[PDB]
């Protein structure tokens, strides 16, 4: 479930609005490249190098991410001065390296090679003013839903407190949100750092309130969060309909996709090895007769047909269109209710899971649906329904079962099978098997293996089991891997593909504790169970 601030327009289909509207955001990265940013403690990396890695991580994520979010880069503490607010004695040592543009591999290359640490020091509040100017002068031309400014500094240098009021007023009026990234966590700094921090705290509290303090981060924690590529998130379209029980009882509902086999939309384009262009490639599907000598046929001589066993039945798309089974349309009709035990999870069908809630802002529908949910739960029963997406989609038979959690209640819909899709095959029994019955010792070895390899932990004092390996929290490694490679080929075209990153392997493997515990039991199993290839 989403936060209360996340509006429902994001889930509704409208002409270039809602899900179809561009969630474009303007982001200005305000980096401190001043002399002090290079000074470091023997054991840890310099703030400059730490902030540089955070920015690289951010930009890399954005380059592969679907979002059309635009990024600008302001540097302060640089030797030279190049900004629109440049005066003879004003906004000195502040450089606008990049103006608000979609991120690209040229930006990443500059961040990694062109950008160098400065020898001077600049006012961080002046840098923020220059950053605000970038947003103020460049958001006019395009449509941006959000405007952000991220400041990366060590708060080591002196600054003027004279522009605080104009800074706060412009951020509020322009609806620009702020975030600070420092070499230290908020929850052995110099006295200047203590002064700078108090002002940063005041600024954040003025803008965000009590929660403002939560928007102050360490480069260390920022690097930890941004090390992985963006997890694919899409807003499910709200599906309006009426849950019908007979023809006299109707319940207004809104359904949304909860589970999907998520994929990246952009795929591989086949191009000529020389021109590297798509236009140079063309596919032509030719037709020839089953009989000898391969007799070609022209498109003006081919008709549509279907096989009915040994019979070949000509059936045009026109005739098929009219004789075709035609559904009444969108529906979610209850056929009846049965024991949940009569619906086995091995029979679950389809490529989606639907969560069904009452129609948006409808209390009457909410109470009505809550009655159904709790009755089914209290009776340990489920609903068997007829589901049809629209007038075109093939109707489905499925299960709608209760889902009662804290802060939300709903019905979960999953398709059930038709008689025509059920192959029961009849498998040999293994219990009756006098040949493959395991010995007492073999059973005890497996018993010991299962206990050692447990992926859960009890006695949390809440009578709740703690999962040691939560797979559903892990992002699909194929995307992470693809992006790593796509990035590698972009920055290093002559180099071969890199090997899989260790953290990826680390997240796909169970805790080292589980692996260690199992060693002895696994050894006992290898000796007790003879295994050999035929």
């Amino acid at each position: 479930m989403h936060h209360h601030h996340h509006h429902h327009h994001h889930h509704e289909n409208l002409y270039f609005q809602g899900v179809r509207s561009g969630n474009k955001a303007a982001v200005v990265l305000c980096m401190d490249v001043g002399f002090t940013m290079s000074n470091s403690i023997p054991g840890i990396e310099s703030p400059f190098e730490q902030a540089k890695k955070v920015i690289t991580m951010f930009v890399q994520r954005q380059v592969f991410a679907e979002n059309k979010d635009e990024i600008a880069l302001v540097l302060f503490g640089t030797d030279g001065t190049d900004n629109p607010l440049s005066g003879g004695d004003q906004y000195q040592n502040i450089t606008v390296h990049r103006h608000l543009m979609l991120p690209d591999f040229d930006l990443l290359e500059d961040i990694e090679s062109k950008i160098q640490p400065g020898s001077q020091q600049a006012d961080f509040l002046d840098a923020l003013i220059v950053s605000m100017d970038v947003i103020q002068h460049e958001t006019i031309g395009k449509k941006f839903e959000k405007r952000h400014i991220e400041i990366f500094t060590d708060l080591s240098s002196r600054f003027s407190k004279s522009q605080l009021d104009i800074i706060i007023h412009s951020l509020k009026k322009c609806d620009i949100s702020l975030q600070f990234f420092l070499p230290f966590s908020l929850g052995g700094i110099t006295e200047q750092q203590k002064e700078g921090l108090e002002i940063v705290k005041m600024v954040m509290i003025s803008l965000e309130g009590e929660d403002g303090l939560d928007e102050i981060y360490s480069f260390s924690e920022s690097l930890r969060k941004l090390c992985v590529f963006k997890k694919i998130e899409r807003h499910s379209i709200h599906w309006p309909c009426r849950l019908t029980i007979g023809s006299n009882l109707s319940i207004r509902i809104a359904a949304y996709k909860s589970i999907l086999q998520e994929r990246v939309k952009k795929t591989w384009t086949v191009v000529d090895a020389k021109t590297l262009k798509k236009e140079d490639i063309q596919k032509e599907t030719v037709y020839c007769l089953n009989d000898d000598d391969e007799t070609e046929v022209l498109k003006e001589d081919i008709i549509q047909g279907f096989r009915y066993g040994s019979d070949i039945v000509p059936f045009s798309k026109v005739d098929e269109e009219q004789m075709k089974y035609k559904s009444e349309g969108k529906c979610f009709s209850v056929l009846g209710f049965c024991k949940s035990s009569q619906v086995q999870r091995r029979f679950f069908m389809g490529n989606q899971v639907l969560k069904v809630f009452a129609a948006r802002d409808d209390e009457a529908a909410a109470v009505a649906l809550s009655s159904l949910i709790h009755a089914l739960d209290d009776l340990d029963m489920v609903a068997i329904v007829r589901y049809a997406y629209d007038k075109r989609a093939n109707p489905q038979v499925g299960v709608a079962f209760p889902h009662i959690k804290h802060n939300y209640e709903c019905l979960v819909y999953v398709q059930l099978p038709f008689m025509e899709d059920l192959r029961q095959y009849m498998f040999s029994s293994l219990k009756n098997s006098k040949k493959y019955a395991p010995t007492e010792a073999q059973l005890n070895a497996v018993d010991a293996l299962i206990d050692s390899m447990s992926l859960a932990k009890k006695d949390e004092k809440t009578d709740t089991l703690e999962d040691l390996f939560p797979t559903t929290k892990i992002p699909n490694p194929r995307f992470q891997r693809l992006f790593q490679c796509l990035l590698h080929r972009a920055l290093h075209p002559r180099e071969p593909l890199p090997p899989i990153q260790q953290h990826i392997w680390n997240m796909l493997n169970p805790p080292a504790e589980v692996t260690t515990k199992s060693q002895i039991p696994l050894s006992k199993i290898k000796t007790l169970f003879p295994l050999i290839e035929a």
Binding site: H2, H5, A25, V27, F58, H148, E150, S177, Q179, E215
Partner: peptide, 7 residues
């Protein structure tokens, strides 16, 4: 909900 650099 995660904002800015994290979003």
């Amino acid at each position: 909900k995660p904002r800015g650099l994290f979003s």
